[PDB]
Design a protein around this nucleic acid. Sequence first.
RNA 1: GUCUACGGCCAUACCACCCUGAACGCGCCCGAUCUCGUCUGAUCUCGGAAGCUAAGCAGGGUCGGGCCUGGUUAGUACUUGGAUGGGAGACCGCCUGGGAAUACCGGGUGCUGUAGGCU
RNA 2: GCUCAGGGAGGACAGAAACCUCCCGUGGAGCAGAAGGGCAAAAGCUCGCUUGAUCUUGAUUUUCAGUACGAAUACAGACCGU
RNA 3: UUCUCAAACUUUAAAUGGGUAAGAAGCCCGGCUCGCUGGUGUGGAGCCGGGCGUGGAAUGCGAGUGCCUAGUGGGCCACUUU
Lengths: 56, 293, 159, 205, 170
Amino acid sequence: AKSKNHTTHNQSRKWHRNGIKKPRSQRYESLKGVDPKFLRNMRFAKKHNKKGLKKM
Amino acid sequence: FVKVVKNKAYFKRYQVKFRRRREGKTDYYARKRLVIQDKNKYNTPKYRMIVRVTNRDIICQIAYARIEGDMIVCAAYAHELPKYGVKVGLTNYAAAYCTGLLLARRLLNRFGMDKIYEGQVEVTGDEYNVESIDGQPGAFTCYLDAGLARTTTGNKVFGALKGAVDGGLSIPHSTKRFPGYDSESKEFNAEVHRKHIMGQNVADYMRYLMEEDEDAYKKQFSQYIKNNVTPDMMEEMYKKAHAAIRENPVYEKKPKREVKKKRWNRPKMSLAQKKDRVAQKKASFLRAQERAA
Amino acid sequence: TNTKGKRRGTRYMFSRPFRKHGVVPLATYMRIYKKGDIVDIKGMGTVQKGMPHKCYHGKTGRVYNVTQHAVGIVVNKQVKGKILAKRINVRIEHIKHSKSRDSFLKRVKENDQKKKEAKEKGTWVQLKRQPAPPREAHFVRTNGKEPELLEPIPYEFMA
Amino acid sequence: GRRPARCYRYCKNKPYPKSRFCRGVPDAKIRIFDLGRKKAKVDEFPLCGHMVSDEYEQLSSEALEAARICANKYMVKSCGKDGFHIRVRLHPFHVIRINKMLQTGMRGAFGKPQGTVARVHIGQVIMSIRTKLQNKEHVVEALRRAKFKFPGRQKIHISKKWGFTKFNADEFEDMVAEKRLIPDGCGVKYIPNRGPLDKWRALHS
Amino acid sequence: KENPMRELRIRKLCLNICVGESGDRLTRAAKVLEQLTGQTPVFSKARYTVRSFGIRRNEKIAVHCTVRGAKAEEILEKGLKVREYELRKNNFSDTGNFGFGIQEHIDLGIKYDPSIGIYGLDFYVVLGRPGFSIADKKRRTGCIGAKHRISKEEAMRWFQQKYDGIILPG
RNA sequence: GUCUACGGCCAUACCACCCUGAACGCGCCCGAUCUCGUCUGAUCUCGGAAGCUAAGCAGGGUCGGGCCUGGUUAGUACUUGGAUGGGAGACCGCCUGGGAAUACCGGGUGCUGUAGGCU
RNA sequence: GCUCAGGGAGGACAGAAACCUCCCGUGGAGCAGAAGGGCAAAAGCUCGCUUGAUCUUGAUUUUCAGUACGAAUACAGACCGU
RNA sequence: UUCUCAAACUUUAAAUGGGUAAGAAGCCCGGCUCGCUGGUGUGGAGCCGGGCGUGGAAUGCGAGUGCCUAGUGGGCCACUUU
């Protein structure tokens, strides 16, 4: 009782019924996966932005 | 009879190495680590101190990486020491040391950190290394490029490295390769290093020969005899030079004589010349055949 | 059922071009990558560390992270159904700058000089790339000689 | 001995040579590919005569062998042993597979090597016969004998070249005259005007 | 006229005692070369096990000693009397260098011993020119060019002119 | 005109052989006391400067090999889309667009960056 | 620090093959194993020292459902080696 | 030199095909923060405050987003590769 093993026949027809959606094109990317030596420093850059506000 | 190793097809196959690897001047394995910067710097120039010991000269440069071709920021050659006191013996450890001190104090002039970072003014042979001051502009950090020279204990390259370190350049190094390092017992001497720095390694050989015979001395040191260099003058001849470098490090270039414009060189034989030679040869071959019969 | 893996069918992809083996050109290591630099991927087989997977070889992303050796580059490998803006840590030898963005900002900066000029004057210069139009009516000078008559050569079998 | 050649006529499979992957193949029935007076000069066999395929089909090593024998047999009965040079300008490299039954079935099916077949394109030379200017109407007959030994359609072309060369018969005699060609065994050596002149000096000596 | 910077000399004299008799008969072969040369040799460890000859992989077969300069001339000097100041034509190699073989080590101011015995040592002369030492540096190395080499025909009229030693046929 | 030190692209730069190279260089080279190594001061290293550019090198040469780059081969091969086209098939033709590669044949033979020389 | 496979040409015993030299040698060797890719002052080879074959979070890749395990690439915090 | 070739060969090398880009989240001024990076108002990134709409290829179309969810998970045929 052998069967059909594999196909990709009807799959392209199915993928374009709701469309092959390009991913969520959003502003402000997350700082996820950024090197955590650089991200420490940028977090300190925002931490002390108050320091130079009377200059600003 | 055997096959031709270098066929008409060997050269279709054959890849040539890089021109600086073909000429046998650059180690691209050694260069691949020295020159390239951590790419999270974003164009911070990675400075390296180049020392290249020739037969008659010692070429000491400071360079940084550029895709066009690494740009030299400062360079002092050994043939600039005759304007400080070192007349002859240009290519010894003592004259190598002065060139390192020359390159150091010149760059520090060309930046404005001349008076800052004095370094070793009393030449010792200790492990001195430049430590930056809070407020004053930070010490110039660069790294030694030996080239294709085997770095055994007491290579002349480490003379010009010790010159830079005693000038005001914060270079990482160890005193394993500075002379006065014994490989068996593994201590380091200040004095035995200084014997090479001030040039008593040379002066003792001048004494050794002059004591032994006057044939093999007048051969070995012609210009030390010719230009009044005695073993007793030797030590102070470099001490006067060490303060003379720190007097006037700024370089005054040699002016060019006007280019008279004669070509010392054969310019390329053009197509109509290259094609006519063989046309004359195919006349010369056929005109000198008909005469035979 | 194919033999699964990572370097399966990369006999020619992560191969090096003919007479371009051996030492890597050192310009490849020392070109700067900022964040938001749109970068095209091409796995050099000589450097085995920090290779992309073969599904990214030829695909253009952009940098969200720069470390000592690699750049975190956001690429659009699709999937079966949808598309996923995903993040691969590719070492810099497997990477060039993309000249696709570097024909637009050249055209921004050039259509700004052609904007600044022809603004104050009242003169008007269209800045949209109008496509290659149907070519305008032109006179074709025949100069003395009649146009050459072509007629089909007859069949004659060579081999 | 083996199947009807109907079964392996058409170029079905990918070109499957005797290699490191396909080992255990028997030798082709065509050992010797050319015969006659093949130890001859260019300048004495001008008239080349070819057999040219109509179809994209596989001719067997054993059909090429029969055609070799049939063409040789007639040329000797016309011109004698030494009045021609016949070639076979195919080489049976495509290995033919046999899924042998003596109970196995289609379960675990990949054929053992049966023999070698010569894959032929359209307008491609199967056999070539260089002969003298006399025997123009014998190479036509000799190859027409051998067309019956092949499947599909073959066409006989009296080539415009000089024997087994790539140079025209009206130009070959006049190209050796200006030392642009050298007689070198069966074939000819075309000298370009591009080698070192010490080669040119050797020619005109 | 002549250019004395094209003066022909000996780069090195390469001597070997191939015994293939390791341990007892090889360590005593070192005493011969130290007498002959005046310097300690390096032992020749094998590449692979050949079984007909009776060697083994990395087993000490031979012992070699290369001598240079002043000493190298004197060691080659006395060997030529034992080959009676005459060499065959085909002793001389394509690339300038040559060699020959004196059969017994006793002929070189070396006296007999019932334990030392009757060794065979083998000479090879490396003929040189100023600037043959370009191709072995770590700085800029290069081929010496075909103009500068020593030929077999010139390596004769070195030996044939220098020593006035005849070069026999047959 | 040209070189040295460090280079960038990595044969238009390679390989073979031949000819000429002012000056500074670069080299062979000179020795082995120190430093450092070795079977051996050839190499590596150090201390030199008597003699030569002979080599390395540099530039030029070759109806040079290679390489790069055009032409050709050839709108051929192959191919996107099309037909109730042909043909027993094998396969081929047309329509609509794209369009290669050797053989053969010419042209070219390193450009050049920072820093310092020499004429 | 060297340069390999293989070949040329020489050298007492010594031959197809033991050893010592010179020359050529784009990889034709070797990189433990299958095969592919990669590599020449090395990734090969011979040595000198060695424990980054260590401890600790996270991110990411591959298979993928975009789950695991295995494997892996990039970091970062220590402590080390050279 | 020559005849004949390779799915597990290849210097070359298509057609169709896969990315990415074709602007206001964009460009150009400045200053300000940093414990990161350093010869260095250095290099980076982040923050405020700006000045600029000719909306910077063609054609068409209103897009976006979140839950809950059935059935299905035996398929088969033709064009062209295979």
